[PDB]
Design a protein around this ligand. Structure first.
Ligand SMILES: [Fe+3]
Length: 308
């Protein structure tokens, strides 16, 4: 049996654990919390941690652990299971990317069509969109978007975008609220993540929704994908089962278990999501380095400078 420190949504961790326990008979115990806090705990616990595996919604959290010498190597054959073009790889082969979440633009298709959409996420923060573009400045993925803009385009461009959103956008407290505002005619479009819409569509039926999704693609900063993944702790003295679990997460059956539970993009190419997601390769995500705590502090400062 193994212990998994879990920073991912509980529904995802529960689903993969259940499918693992059914396939192998090995029991999984989840210790759930925020990834940053769990990573901190793995560092403090060191040689004495009870964690066999760390399962996170954000692979960026692995960098510090790898640097601290706390992660075990994984089989190269396992790593190759999800190594599609664009997928981040661990330089020391000591963690693996498993799934993705995408930025998107949700729009009311009864008011707008793809003719009204922009080729660049930068262009939504301009006067054409005055009073017509929703955004959620307190959202984690919104922060990741700012980080990506700074990296890809520089701070002046990132700051200008934020100022443009202050001037032209409508602020919503949460992604769900922004989605509902589009559905109810309050705003014709909003900057969001893919999962909300795909969940609502599966549950309600797309024919019963006024909103649709627009993907910018062509490696625009607005095509940003955030990656979830897993790692084995070097401290584990149950490497055999820990490695077996990570191998399983990258397997067809493990990926199928995840995508039935959560509207994330599988990184195996032979797995199809029942939420009707497009294949990962068609998103044309940009390549962006991992978000560090320093990147986050800098991005928060830009948000503050913009009056948000
Ligand atoms: Fe969210």
């Amino acid at each position: 049996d193994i212990t998994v420190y879990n920073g991912q949504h509980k529904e995802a961790a529960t689903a993969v654990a259940k499918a693992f326990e059914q396939e192998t008979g090995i029991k999984v115990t989840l210790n759930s919390g925020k990834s940053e806090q769990l990573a901190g705990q793995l560092k403090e616990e060191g040689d004495k941690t009870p964690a066999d595996v760390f399962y996170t919604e954000q692979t960026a959290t692995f960098a510090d652990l790898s640097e601290a010498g706390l992660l075990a190597p994984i089989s190269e054959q396992t790593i190759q299971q999800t190594a599609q073009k664009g997928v981040p790889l661990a330089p020391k082969k000591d963690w693996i990317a498993l799934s993705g979440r995408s930025r998107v633009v949700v729009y009311d298709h009864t008011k707008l069509s793809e003719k009204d959409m922009e080729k660049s996420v930068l262009d939504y923060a301009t006067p054409k969109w005055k009073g017509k573009i929703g955004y959620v400045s307190t959202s984690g993925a919104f922060l990741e978007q700012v980080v990506a803009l700074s990296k890809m385009k520089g701070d002046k461009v990132a700051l200008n975008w934020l100022k443009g959103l202050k001037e032209n956008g409508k602020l919503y407290a949460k992604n769900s609220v922004a989605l509902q505002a589009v559905e109810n005619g309050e705003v014709p479009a909003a900057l969001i993540n893919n999962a909300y819409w795909y969940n609502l569509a599966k549950e309600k039926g797309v024919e019963n929704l006024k909103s649709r999704l627009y993907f910018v693609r062509h490696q625009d900063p607005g095509a940003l994908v955030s990656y979830s993944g897993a790692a084995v702790l070097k401290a584990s003295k149950n490497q055999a089962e820990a490695q077996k679990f990570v191998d399983f997460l990258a397997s067809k059956k493990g990926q199928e278990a995840l995508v039935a539970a959560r509207a994330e993009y599988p990184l195996r190419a032979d797995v199809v999501s029942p939420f009707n997601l497009e294949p990962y390769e068609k998103l044309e995500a940009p390549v962006v380095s991992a978000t560090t705590a320093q990147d986050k502090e800098h991005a928060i400062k830009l948000i503050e400078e913009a009056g948000l």
